[PDB]
């Protein structure tokens, strides 16, 4: 996260770290959506242009974390993956369309002060909250700058950007399965996701029921926190039917 701040303890208890077993390193962020299911970006697991194609046994999920590098004894819980499910129409060849994947855990994780699932939006909540200008929150342990690493979880609040502005910022073809967020050059404030934040949640707190909903998944950007550029996020609600189908059939 660029231009963010240290998270408070327990501020993002759905935050998940995807952790590579060998070598031991952060791979991506992700989010806890129930005691056995974790949501992330497809490109975290499968990206042929960079020879990335992880299998279940390559990875661990670390939940309840705050420190990036520490082993947080008695606080974090580390889980093995039973199965990975990548969206069948995930477009890695072009623009990361449908950049979404589910991971089933081998055993249910125990909820605690530091571990708790985020909500997924229903149509009404999405319609109400996904509006240009409305702010969401992005969290992660990724790079603090485009070209080091944070000691603890970083957080930044960012406004959703008008679709025409999103489209006009890039040569990449944007789809209805994506939205963009970030401040404009003239707004003065800044902030963005960066390398290592991929897969993490873009969340909003509903002013209707005061619950946190994951509206987006950190997906792609051209550089990090560049003027006139914006972060792109997978539109979680637009892909909700796939999410439910996977959980229904394999849950």
């Amino acid at each position: 996260i660029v231009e963010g701040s240290d998270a408070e303890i327990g501020m993002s208890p759905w935050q998940v770290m995807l952790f590579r077993k060998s070598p031991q390193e952060l791979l991506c962020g992700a989010s806890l959506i129930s005691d056995r299911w974790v949501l992330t970006a497809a490109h975290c697991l499968l990206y042929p242009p960079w020879d990335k194609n992880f299998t279940e046994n390559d990875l661990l999920v670390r939940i309840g974390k705050h420190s990036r590098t520490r082993y947080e004894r008695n606080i974090e819980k580390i889980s093995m993956l039973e199965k990975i499910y990548i969206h069948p129409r995930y477009n890695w060849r072009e623009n990361l369309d449908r950049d979404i994947a589910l991971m089933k855990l081998k055993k249910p994780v125990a909820f605690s002060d530091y571990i708790h699932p985020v909500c997924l939006p229903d149509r009404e909540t999405a319609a109400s909250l996904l509006q240009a200008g409305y702010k969401g929150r992005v969290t992660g342990w990724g790079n603090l700058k485009e070209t080091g690493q944070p000691s603890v979880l970083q957080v930044v609040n960012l406004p959703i950007v008008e679709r025409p502005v999103c489209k006009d910022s890039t040569r990449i073809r944007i789809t209805d399965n994506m939205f963009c967020a970030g401040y404009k050059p003239d707004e003065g404030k800044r902030g963005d996701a960066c390398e290592g934040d991929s897969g993490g949640p873009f969340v909003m707190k509903s002013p209707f029921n005061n619950r946190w909903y994951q509206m987006g998944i950190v997906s792609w950007g051209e550089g990090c926190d560049r003027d006139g550029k914006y972060g792109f996020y997978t539109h979680v609600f637009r892909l909700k039917k796939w999410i439910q189908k996977v959980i229904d059939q394999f849950g």
Binding site: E8, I9, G10, H116, G136, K205, R211
Partner: peptide
Amino acid sequence: EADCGLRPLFEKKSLEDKTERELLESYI
């Protein structure tokens, strides 16, 4: 999931985090 999105250290105790008000103020 009945309890989803309510944080043990914030919503469950009626404590607010340091910047959530910024989000609320943007929901105009």
